[PDB]
Amino acid sequence: PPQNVTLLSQNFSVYLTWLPGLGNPQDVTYFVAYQSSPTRRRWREVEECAGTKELLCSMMCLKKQDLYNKFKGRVRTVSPSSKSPWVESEYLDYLFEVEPAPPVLVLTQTEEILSANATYQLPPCMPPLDLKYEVAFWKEGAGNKTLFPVTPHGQPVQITLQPAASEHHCLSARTIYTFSVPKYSKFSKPTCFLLE
Amino acid sequence: CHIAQFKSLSPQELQAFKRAKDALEESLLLKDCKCRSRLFPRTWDLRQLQVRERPVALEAELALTLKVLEATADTDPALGDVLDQPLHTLHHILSQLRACIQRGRLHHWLHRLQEAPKKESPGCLEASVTFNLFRLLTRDLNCVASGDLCV
Amino acid sequence: MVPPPENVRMNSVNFKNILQWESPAFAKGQLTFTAQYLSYRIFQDKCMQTTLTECDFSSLSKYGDHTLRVRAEFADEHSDWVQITFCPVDDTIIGPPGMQVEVLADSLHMRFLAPKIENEYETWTMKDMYNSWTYNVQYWKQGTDEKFQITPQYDFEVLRNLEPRTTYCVQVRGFLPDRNKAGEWSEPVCEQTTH
Ligand SMILES: *[C@@H]1O[C@H](CO)[C@@H](O)[C@H](O)[C@H]1NC(C)=O
Ligand SMILES: *[C@@H]1O[C@H](CO)[C@@H](O)[C@H](O)[C@H]1NC(C)=O
């Protein structure tokens, strides 16, 4: 049986992660199922993850899954000749434990103005969440980073640009998801180039 | 209609609802919550109903939620203090929803909602209204407040 | 009978709800004031036996109406209930947004920062509380006192076609067209455009 099984959340989605058993052979295979807090009797099995050897399974959206109540998952190692007991993870409430991903910045340089939009690869079945993005802007070689106010998702960030050209400017964006308390994300990798 | 303001609730209000939901769930651990029929679980979503029918569907669900939670609060004082602010907010939302609305799926849903209190145990009713609270406040209320935008 | 509090009002800027009253004259000694809010159907109590003439009600729900009450007590005896009604959604006073104006040659670039709510978080500002929120910008050249009004669609705006070597003063305020409610103007910031 897997030693540490964790139901974690990242990139707006939920995953179940385990590790191989200490004595488990190399031909080890894993089967995973999930249950919801409202219904403790049902233990519906994940079809896409059934028979997987990948130590990682995705439980983002499954049949008859409720993301508005906490749910848990279990995983077992199924040998070709034996089956191990199910190992259940902890309950995960999606609306309060979802880790947002950094946004994808789209840059458009209008005359004396730089517009930075944020685009998101949200899951199709994700609940409607409040997503806002803060934009840090700076010059290469200097630690002075100007941090702009949070902007709602679907609205661009307009940065005033000086007439000066042939300069190294870089941008990054951080997602702030707010349901009851703000959860921040890591700043996106700085994708930057020469302007004007 | 001034319901558009309920598209998103203040995080402080959502914190209060979370506290109430946790307290209600803890009480449910002891009570026997078995339902003759899963009335609250809704197979269809308000989106499937016409924009005009979405409010009346939510109003009936919200009225049941309020009624069951009101009784639970009166029965247990320990739940009364934590459920007070949630109940106040829910009643205000209910008043706006009613003041907003001047056979099919909707008729059966309304009949089932009306007959549920007189045929189901109070414990399972309060369990159903508890586990549907954020479903109603984040998925339904948002679509109803959104109006034509929700599709 | 000890006198009730006088001039009981609720000043609430950016949902910073504060109940204020004036302590009535009483030569017997200092008066202790208790305040309560009608939560649902029962009157819950804050600011119990508060020597101060001020109570904080910012913890109140921001949705729906509330009924507040304050009274004064000296030892066993107490005053009468002084009851007011507070509706945070519309009774609140919209504060002035922060202003960041930069002169860029012959133009002004202004960025407006939404009035923050201390009870809420930096993500939840007064822009998200009111879905119909918009910004009104009023600018004028110094001396002429001829105001010009614009309504930016977002929190950033550019004023162009400005005379060179000339100083203009600008203000910004939040507005709610669906209810015709306007916040207080920001302090006029005056900036010079040169070459
Ligand atoms: C499981 O986690 C523990 C830490 O408590 C660690 O010692 C152990 O190595 C982990 N299991 C595996 C297979 O790495
Ligand atoms: C910014 O992106 C959002 C979606 O990510 C889009 O709805 C909006 O129109 C964009 N604004 C622009 C391109 O100015």
Author numbering:
A (entry chain B): 6 to 201
B (entry chain C): 4 to 105, 115 to 163
C (entry chain A): 20 to 214
Quote the paper.
When they were initially discovered, type III interferons (IFNλ1-3) were structurally and evolutionarily classified as members of the IL-10 superfamily of cytokines. Further investigation, though, revealed that they are functionally interferons (IFNs) with distinct roles in mucosal and innate immunity. While predicted to be structurally similar to IFNλ1-3, IFNλ4 shares only 28% amino acid sequence identity with its closest relative IFNλ3 and has a distinct biochemical composition resulting in IFNλ4 being one of the most positively-charged known cytokines (pI = 11.3). We next use protein engineering to overcome the affinity limitation for structural determination of the ternary IFNλ cytokine-receptor complex and determine the 72 kilodalton (kDa) structures of IFNλ4 as well as IFNλ3 in complex with IFNλR1 and an affinity-matured IL10Rβ via cryogenic electron microscopy (cryoEM).
